[PDB]
Structures are given as structure tokens and as C-alpha cells.
Symmetry: D2
Subunit: 212 residues, 4 copies
């Protein structure tokens, strides 16, 4: 399925759309392409559009970063074991917000550290206001490994490898989770990509490789 989606993405990058934006009528719950995609929530990604998926073809799982965390695994388990998908595509992307902050800064700002509160405003260009209380949850914001770059910075080699390392960790999480079959007759297959938000083109991430 997926090389065909990469060709749809080549068209998309070149200025030709493939997704049909109208309502498809009544459909069954099982994704017809037997695919699940995990992508960032970033507004610049329309996952169906950039892959040329049609409505009804794939599960679309999206969170901050497109990270493979506990919820992503919950989703993938349901997708495969209950709803019959057997392929997974990861779509991280360039200029991702998860490159631009650290867990501890945001935590401290929310808790009420005045320095962290000020620093987050400086990093974001908005008037961040502390909650002034601590929380146990969420336990982790899952910012990408590495020191932060400016928010929405243009691409670079260094940031591409930081994004790619996060993709590789997600591939390893899926390929070693006890409740996802990625070998034998019920197996799932998985590939990971980085979407360039400015060009519209996907590039594939190597696996195995370094993971953060």
C-alpha cells in the first residue's frame, strides 16, 4: 500500500492533490487499506492529504510529535487486534514543536517557577501564564532528545537526525512491545518517515539506527 502512498505524496509535494474531501457515504469500521498512521498533531499536516489516503482507508492516530507512547500503543493494539490493520506508518515532520522545548522547563513553568514562566514566553513569543500548581499527569511531555532549537526553525542536518532518532525509537517500541505481533502469522509491518512541511515531501528513516 505504502509505496503507492509515497507516489501520492510525490504528487502532493509537486502541487497535485489526491485525497477526495467529500463525505464517502456509509462505510465499515475496518480500515480498508489495513493501515494505521501515527503522525504529529501539527496543523500543517493533513495526513490523508499528504499520503493520498481516501476517507475510510486508514486509522489516523495523532499526538504532539507523533510519538510512540502508551496511548499510541493502546491505539495500535486496538487497530490491529480488533480492527484488522497490519501495517503501520510513522509520519514525524520538520519544524516540529517537540524540537523546541524541554519537559522540565514546561513543568516548572506550569508549577509556577517565575523564571521558567518568563523563559517559556521568550521561547514561544506568547504570554505564557503559569498554572501555579503541580500535577502528576502528564508524566512526560516527550520533547525530542537533544537541546532545544528555536520554535519553528527551518530544517537542518542536526534537527533532521534528532527527528529521525525519535522515529527510530518509535519503530523499536512497536517492534518490541509484548502486545504487538510484528513477526509470525498475525504480524504487523512498520516504516517511518519525516514529512517536510515546506516542500510537502516525505523522506524515509533508516532502521535499525540510533534512537536519541
Amino acid at each position: 500500500n505504502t509505496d503507492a502512498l509515497l507516489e501520492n505524496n510525490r504528487l502532493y509535494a509537486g502541487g497535485q492533490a489526491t485525497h477526495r474531501p467529500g463525505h464517502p457515504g456509509m462505510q465499515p469500521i475496518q480500515p480498508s487499506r489495513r493501515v494505521a498512521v501515527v503522525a504529529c498533531m501539527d496543523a500543517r499536516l493533513d495526513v490523508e492529504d499528504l499520503l493520498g489516503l481516501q476517507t475510510g482507508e486508514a486509522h489516523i492516530i495523532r499526538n504532539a510529535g507523533g510519538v510512540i507512547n502508551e496511548d499510541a500503543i493502546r491505539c495500535l493494539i486496538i487497530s490491529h487486534h480488533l480492527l484488522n490493520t497490519h501495517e503501520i506508518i510513522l509520519v514525524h515532520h520538520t519544524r516540529c514543536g517537540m524540537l523546541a522545548f524541554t519537559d522540565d522547563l514546561l513543568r516548572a513553568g506550569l508549577e509556577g517557577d517565575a523564571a521558567a514562566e518568563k523563559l517559556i514566553g521568550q521561547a514561544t513569543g506568547r504570554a505564557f501564564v503559569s498554572a501555579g500548581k503541580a500535577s502528576a499527569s502528564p508524566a512526560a511531555f516527550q520533547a525530542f532528545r537533544g537541546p532545544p532549537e528555536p520554535l519553528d526553525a527551518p530544517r537542518s542536518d542536526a534537527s533532521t537526525e534528532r527527528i529521525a532518532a525519535d522515529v527510530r525509537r518509535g519503530l523499536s517500541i512497536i517492534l518490541n512491545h509484548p502486545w504487538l505481533p510484528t513477526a509470525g502469522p498475525d504480524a504487523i509491518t512498520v516504516r517511518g518517515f519525516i514529512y517536510d512541511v515546506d516542500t510537502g515531501r516525505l523522506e524515509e528513516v533508516s532502521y535499525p539506527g540510533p534512537m536519541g
Copy 2:
């Protein structure tokens, strides 16, 4: 923003699309409509299409059920505090898979209970195969409260209220989480809906109301 999106959805339901499926070119990370949408991963939902959002306008957060769990809160915190959104829309939907199983059945099937394994096959119409091992994570599959109905069953009053109760719980989670400002000068506003996958039309969920 949102009543305009409901009008786009009225068009969508009636057979007229509003989302433009081509690449929009270079854009900034901040969602231009300052909106975050949390929806189910169900393949029959194209969130941008059914709301008439354009690429670049909204964060799109999607998981099994569109539930407000720890990851959804992680996403919303980033969306608002770092990326300046201030409105949230919840889109649960009809014929959702989260109406059709229970946490304990799926857990036991994955663990290797032969009865549960067989029962999940009967419920799903696929050859479910146990992992044969236990896992601590995910801690909860977050199936909707109430006894399970058949997978992909047509709408009913009872199931509409089960979906609506889950939407109300998600609204309450957001409106009482320590790290989401939903009052005062940094506040976020939130509304919840059920998307009818067969008609293409949204219906709004009342709040406050019963929560499961």
C-alpha cells in the same frame, strides 16, 4: 470559529466538500484558527474534511475513541501553552469501536486466556491471536462505559447516550485539569460533538450532564 465549522459540516453532510486537499505551501507552526480538535482515529473520520478546516488551521489530535486521557491532555497543554490555541472541539462519532469491547476481555485475550481469545474472534470477525504474555501498559484501553454492543452496530438512542456520556467526561476532564486554564485571561473554551459517520453530520453534546 466553530459555528462556521458547523456550517461547513452541514455542507459536508449534504454532499458539498470544503477542505482543500492540496499542499498549502509554507506555513507557521501556530494553528491559524487557534483551535485544537480531539477525535477518534476511526478511518471514516477525516477531521479536516468534516469540519471544513484548511491545512494549517487546527491541531488534530486523534486516538481510539477520541478519549480525553493523559496523552490527550499532554497534547492540549502543548497546543495552548506553547502554540497559542484557545479553543477545543471534541468529535466522538457513531458506530465507534470503543462501544464494542471491554478492557478486561482484551487484556485477558492478550494475556493468553483461551476463552477470551475465542470470544474476541467472535466479536471482531477476525482471527484474534493472543500474545501469551502480560503487560503493564497500556494500563487502560478506555472502552466506553456500558456493556458492549456488536462491533460497528447501527445508531441507537442507548448508544448515542453512551457516546455522549464519554464526551461529557472528556469535557469535565479538560475543565478541571490543573494545567489547562479554562477561566481567566488565558482561558480555553471547549465544546463536544458526535459525528454521524453515515450522514456526515455533527450533533452537539449537552454539558454539564451525566459522565458514564
Copy 3:
């Protein structure tokens, strides 16, 4: 180490204590017996006392039920990989509160369902008062599989097997988690028990076996 602790427990059950309750003076952080124990928080368990451990000998990890959940795994990973333990003992126990409620009842009572609120009072014999709001966390209360029995009910065959099944699931979680080595030259070994709070005696749980 552990058969010696079982002999200390035989003494304890018979009315002879082995733990020394005074301060042992300065000690190193590494547990001297290279053991970690995971037990219920139940007030009737003094883990050091019932095993005849001395202060400084073992990590003592305790939560509601003694369940192997994400935090228990966090603890065990630190215990072994950083602090050199290589044996794990699970101590579930009789008359455990985790036999007496269900996740959904407590959730609904906390959310504000008036029926659930009343029912929890009836089950607990205390004036339970709803919080009147929903929360994403904790995602699961981890009550033992099976229908609830009365709070603090005396032992039975049925409840012993419900406790034992939870112990077996915890053993399977540990023995299949990606980040706990339970084979090869860095391996950890693990055994599981039920502590009888009334007699003071441990009984060992079979493994492999049914897991809930």
C-alpha cells in the same frame, strides 16, 4: 536468600519476630540482600517484619494491591539496573481491598454519579463523598479481576485464586518487560506469594498459571 526469608516468616507466623526495629546506623544505598519486594500498602503488612528482613537489606516497593504496574516497573528497573538487586519477591495478601471494588464504580462515584456514590458508601461502611469532576488520572485503579467480594471478607478458595491470578500476571509482566533482564548474565529471578494476614504465614503462588 528467599528460602531463609520463608523460614523467618514461619517463625513470624508462629509468634517469633526476626526484624530488629532500631536504627542500623550508616549504610550504603545498595540493598545488601540484592532483593526487591513488591507488596500491598495494606497496613497489616510490615514487609520487613513478615519476611525477617533487616533494615538495609531489600528495596520495599508498596502500592494498592502490590500490583505490577508502570510505577512498579519503574522501581524495579532502578532497583536492578542502578542499585544491583537481582531477585524479586511479590507479596500479595489475603483480605486485600483490591478484591472489593471495581474501577468503574469508583470512577463514577468520583465523577459524581449519585448512585455510584451511594453504592460506594454501602460497600465501604464510610461516608464516601464524590469529587464531582472527572479526571484522566489515574487511568486505572487496578482492582483484581473478578466480581467484587465484601470489603475485608475472610479467606476463601475463590478469593485465593483471584489473588493468585493477579500475582501470576505480575510475574508475567516482569518476565516479559523489555527493560528487565530475566535471562542471561544480568538476569533477575522472581517468585510470588500470598501473605495470610490472619495467620502471618506466606504461601507460594504457582507459575506459569492463569492470569486473571
Copy 4:
């Protein structure tokens, strides 16, 4: 209850024990002192001993660091709402392992980064061996804020304030969690302490104050 426990701790520090280490016979599940204690799993802490609690008097919740995380909240909710406790004591302690590593180092070592693997061996003085795979869980190891000190280093002002800040964050988590009543007629009260493992004496942490 708690000032009496502090006097028992003064005796303990001075070389006089108060906890009785034998089996107390049959007891009810409700902690008789209506207290829950959250402490580190560190082997040098025997919580009942250092507070002079008797078996049956208090819930004893223990994890790496004594941190207030999602599981600690799960435990406290059960403790109060089902089992009638209404006081909480936090016991962090000196020379805690959570002062000596960072989440990202341990994650990377477990994932298989050879540099991180080597560095963890150097920090711990043991032969740390990578798992060679990624995991989504545990999402956070919850090392204390601040740069790492040597494992099991002697006390200092700087490390005392790092421990105290973690205690204050835990107090704030409890005092702002939606499902713990810490005001009104069902309220819980809470105090936080640092246990000196070398002297045996507790010292109380100020609240409100800085939180990491």
C-alpha cells in the same frame, strides 16, 4: 497522630526503637491511625520503624524516590475514599538514588546507546548492560530536578533543597488533584519530611515553597 510519630522518630534517631516486630494477630483493613505514608523504596528506610508506627496503623506506600506520581495518587485515593484515612505523611530521605541519575541517560542506556551504557556503569559502579530496545513505559523515571550528584553522596545544603523541592511538588500535587479532598468535611491533611538515613532523624519541609 503525627507529632507523636515525630517523638517516636526522635527516640529512633537516639537509639531507642518503638515498632513491635511481631505479628499483631487479626486486624481490620482500615488503618487504625487513619494515616497514609508515602516513602522511598530505599532499603535503609523501614517506615514503620522510623515513625514508630505499629503494624495495622498506617498505609505504607513506597516507590523510587517516594514521588507523588500517578500510582501514588491511585494509592491515596483508595486509602482515603475506600479505607478512611485522612492524613498523609511524605518521607523523602537523604542520599536518595533519585539525586544521582537523569531520565534521559537511563533511557538511552536501556535503548542501547553504547556511550550511555558505559556512563551508567561509571555512575553506579556496577556492570550495567543495555536492554538494546526501546520501551514506551515507564514514561518517566522521575529523577529529582537538578543535575546529578554522585550516587549515595553525603548530605549537603544543595542536595537537601533538591530533595525538599521534590517534597513540595508532591504536596502541591496532592493538594490540587481533582480526586483528593484536601478541604471541606471529607478533607485530608498532609505534611512532608526528609529522613536523614545516617542520623535516623526526620526534618520537616516547608510548604508552600519552590517545587523543583
